[PDB]
């Protein structure tokens, strides 16, 4: 199966997309209500928005890719009064990036994400989306590096 | 329609999307790994609980005054024989007299005994009992859902 | 026939119903997310273990006196090259002589070296090692199961 979904509890779901090489945590944080098919589909759409934002910034498949990487971590849904989501993403730049190259990657990425995630508007799920972007630096050529290392999800599990 | 996950050999989460239910399957006494039969059993007890519910009243209709009968956990004892303890919540609105509460419990207990086939060997040769926890909630609140995660704390 | 769940990106439970097995897959050294190849690798090591089991004796035979060889965990190291550590349990009848244990232990170790392709690159280009834990249980006790949940505590 291309996507493997698991309930750790009614309101905490792991979603591993093999085909696209992504991993996200789904949380129904505010209400603690059980995740439904709609919530998971919403999460899949935001996972797609992030990999599409990544594709706009540069192809992360090419060998020697110099970054940045934009990676989804968690979609936290607030379904108490209205339908809202907070998407947590990591921006990963190379340890060898200069002050300006970082400020540049950060602004470009935020622009792409505001568009792809439909920030501050209601989307095709009638969900209004916001995001938070954590910044990381890593030696991108290191054998120790993977854009979705398990460590990067500790906040959410 | 149904998503099943093994948190450990003996602890399984079962999310039924179609019927909007969630149950924890636990093989409590022995700690033996859950097999397809145990999952089938859990699914059939989930069906029994929602059947009991519909017998008390449709929980789909807006305005539904309650009460809610919700499955939480199916604990299987497969040591010598095949037994199951089904943990359910009976959820009553906070605006309900004590006469109404006990009256709703009794009506609940009676529907569960029939639907879960309590004290008899069922289609899976399983002998079933249940334990029912009483909760009161403002059914109309935006912060209420019959299967809120907090209701599962004791089984996860 | 197989149920796979991600507890985290690098920790997967795998329940094989048809062959009655359970294993924890972890990408220990790197913490990298498990991919389809890693899971397929785990399934191959699970198969190696049950083939080793059939070598030592049909565990599906009634009154099966033992021993049991059971997979617990496959820990993948994919940092520089592709390697796997397979954690297994050897379970002997609690009433066996020192020499009968010794014989069981060396026969399982040999069948496993072969079945898990120890020290050589396998069909997934992975180089495997294993680690064996010794157990004894009353194999006829109703409280006994080769894959009891207690046996995976080190890994979950």
Cβ neighbors of B4 (< 8 A, separation 6 or more) are: B12, B13, B14, B15, B39, C3
Task: Give kind and range of the element (H or E) at residue A36.
Answer: none
* Backbone angle region of C79, left / alpha / beta, with phi > 0 → left and psi within -120 to 50 → alpha: alpha
Instruction: Using DSSP, state whether B44 is helix, strand or coil.
Output: helix
Enter the resolution in angstroms.
2.0
Integer distance in angstroms from the first to the last C-alpha of chain A?
23
| Residues belonging to chain C | 156
Q: A37-57 and A99-116 are packed helices; what angle lies between their axes, rounded to 10 degrees? A: 140
Taking the Cβ of residue C20 and every Cβ of chain B, the question of whether any pair is shorter than 8 Å is answered with yes
CA-based angle B34:B43:C146, to the nearest 5?
A: 5
Taking the Cβ of residue A41 and every Cβ of chain B, the question of whether any pair is shorter than 8 Å is answered with no
Give the Cα separation of C34 and C116 in Å (integer).
20
CA-based angle C39:C43:C49, to the nearest 5?
A: 145
Task: Give kind and range of the element (H or E) at residue A129.
Answer: strand A128-138
Q: Count Cα neighbours of C49 within 13 Å in the Cβ-side half-sphere.
A: 31
Give the Cα separation of B49 and B118 in Å (integer).
12
Does residue A111 contact residue A119 with C-beta atoms inside 8 Å? no
Q: Per the structure block, which two tokens stand in for A16? A: 């591993």
Within 8 A of B30 by CB-CB distance, chain C residues are 143, 145, 148
Topology adopted by domain C1-156:
Alpha-Beta Plaits (3.30.70)
Q: Per the structure block, which two tokens stand in for A38? A: 């709609």
Whether the upstream peptide bond of residue B87 has omega within 30° of 0, thus cis, is: no
Q: What is the DSSP string of B90-149?
A: EEEESS--HHHHHHHHHHHHHHHHHHTTBTSB-TTS-EEEEEEEEEEE-TT-TT--TT-G
Chain C residue at shortest CA distance from A12: C7
* CATH 3.40.50.2300 is right for the domain spanning A1-157: no
- Check residue A137 and report its DSSP letter: E
Interface test with chain A among B2, B5, B72, B154, by most A beta carbons within 10 Å: B5
Whether the upstream peptide bond of residue C148 has omega within 30° of 0, thus cis, is: no
Render the burial of C30-66: b for 16+ CB within 10 Å, e for the rest. bbbbbeeebbebbbbbbbbbbebbebbbebeeeeeeb
Does residue B94 contact residue B136 with C-beta atoms inside 8 Å? yes
Interface test with chain A among B4, B46, B141, B148, by most A beta carbons within 10 Å: B148
Q: What is the DSSP string of chain C?
A: -EEEEEEETTEEEEEETTTTEEEEEE-TTT-PPP-HHHHHHHHHHHHHHHHHHHHH--TTSTT----EEEEEEEEEE-SSS-EEEEEEEEEEETT--HHHHHHHHHHHHHHHHHHTTBTSB-TTS-EEEEEEEEEEE-TT-TT--TT-GGGGTTT-
């Amino acid at each position: 199966e291309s996507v493997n979904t698991s309930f750790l509890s009614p309101s905490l779901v792991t979603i591993r997309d093999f085909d696209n090489g992504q991993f996200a945590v789904l949380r129904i944080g505010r209400t603690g209500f059980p995740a439904d098919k709609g919530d998971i589909d919403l999460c899949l759409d935001k996972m797609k928005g992030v990999r599409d934002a990544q594709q706009s910034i540069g192809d992360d498949t090419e060998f020697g890719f110099k970054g940045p990487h934009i990676r989804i971590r968690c979609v936290d849904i607030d379904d108490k009064h209205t339908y809202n989501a907070m998407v947590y993403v990591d921006l990963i730049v190379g340890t060898g990036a200069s002050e300006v190259e970082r400020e540049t990657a950060e602004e470009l990425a935020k622009e792409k994400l505001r568009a792809a995630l439909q920030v501050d508007i209601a989307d095709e799920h009638s969900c209004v989306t916001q995001f938070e972007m954590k910044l990381r630096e890593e030696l991108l050529s290191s054998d120790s590096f993977h854009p979705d290392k398990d460590e990067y999800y500790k906040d959410f599990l």
